Design a protein around this ligand. Structure first.
Ligand code: EEM
Ligand code: SF4
Length: 340
């Protein structure tokens, strides 16, 4: 509010880059505890005697490192590629799918070699030009929520804005967007916000900005000329979900009335969870009301990893049809990019 870490790790090589140097100067000036780590993927000594303590303390830890990977992962259906600027999040969403992603770490990571990263991005753009290449910057982090510390996203926005065939997009649950409002985005960045029913936000999204805060930020970014979008996710069949999601879209329309919404986009993602999710989530959030009963679900098998549970076809279809009705009612001429 906005996020500031209570412990910072640096890779020694990180100090060779402007961002690493800048962050070391900032955090030493603030008197924050700073440690050294050989790799940002191998961070040792995070305080805590229990698993819950170590998890919660990791969520208050920042790790400053060099990105050595290299190839960008695909990010379909959002975008062609995930541009890697950060990994991890300070938020505590009970359902967060990043918790059980292969190789995910609970701490927040930021990468300092932006020249390298943007160079590789340009390479991907050139490989496909004159076709457009889209980059997702919040695939494995809340890149916006972290950004006031680094301005790495602001730099990426302006990098992409300068390109002819590159486009950028990202989604956030945080309202701390003021430093991004004067960025030279050149119309090539889609600024999105995660929204949900009152039930889901109140019960499952602690440590994030409120709905009203997210909408205040949305009006700001739209007013600064960014393309605006919303991601309705996770779509979760809680008791009274039909009316809950009806009221979401009704309230969303009221909070955006007056504004031009001719190019507004919606993305719909149903709640999914993996086989190890129940054990992990119940350890980290003992009092959660999140239902992870796999017997009511359909399993989608993994390809190179493990798969996940989604709602059954009938219930998934019901969710999709209902969401599409609401968007048609309150946002005629808004585009629904996908339901998954
Ligand atoms: C990985 Se989230 C990273 C970006 C940012 N920190 C944010 O929260 O918007 C990206 C989206 O995915 C959703 N999401 C998270 N977990 C799940 C899930 N388990 N099932 C279904 N959806 C899940 C979140 O609500 C987001 O809309
Ligand atoms: S804000 Fe996004 S990345 Fe952070 S815990 Fe919530 S879903 Fe996960």
């Amino acid at each position: 509010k906005p996020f500031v870490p209570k412990l910072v790790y640096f890779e020694p090589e990180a100090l060779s880059y402007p961002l690493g140097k800048e962050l070391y100067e900032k955090f030493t000036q603030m008197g924050i505890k700073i440690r050294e780590t050989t790799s940002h993927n191998q961070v040792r000594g995070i305080p805590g005697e229990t698993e819950l303590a170590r998890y919660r303390n990791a969520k208050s830890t920042l790790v400053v490192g060099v990105r050595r990977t290299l190839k960008f992962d695909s990010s379909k259906p959002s975008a062609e590629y995930a541009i890697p600027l950060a990994t991890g999040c300070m938020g505590h969403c009970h359902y967060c799918y990043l918790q059980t992603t292969l190789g995910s770490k609970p701490y927040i990571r930021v990468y300092v070699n932006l020249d390298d990263i943007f160079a590789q991005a340009q390479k991907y753009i050139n490989e496909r030009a004159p076709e457009i290449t889209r980059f997702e910057a919040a695939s494995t982090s809340d890149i916006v929520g972290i950004d006031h510390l680094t301005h790495s996203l602001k730099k990426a926005i302006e990098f992409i804005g300068a390109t002819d065939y590159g486009r950028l997009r990202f989604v956030t649950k945080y309202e701390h967007v003021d430093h991004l409002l004067d960025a030279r985005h050149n119309g090539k960045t889609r600024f999105r916000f995660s929204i949900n029913s009152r039930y889901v936000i109140n019960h499952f999204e602690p440590g994030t900005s409120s709905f009203d805060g997210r909408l205040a930020a949305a009006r700001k970014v739209a007013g600064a000329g960014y393309k605006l979008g919303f991601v309705v996710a996770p779509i979760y069949r809680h008791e009274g979900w039909e009316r809950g999601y009806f009221e979401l879209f009704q309230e969303l329309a009221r909070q955006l009335e007056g504004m031009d919404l001719s190019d507004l986009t919606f993305e719909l993602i149903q709640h999914r969870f993996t086989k190890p999710a129940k054990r992990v989530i119940e350890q980290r959030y003992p009092k959660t009301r999140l239902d992870l009963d796999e017997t009511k679900r359909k399993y989608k098998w993994g390809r190179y990893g493990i798969g996940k549970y989604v709602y059954r076809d009938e219930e998934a279809k019901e969710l999709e049809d209902t969401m599409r009705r609401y968007i048609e009612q309150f946002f005629p001429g808004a585009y629904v990019q996908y339901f998954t």
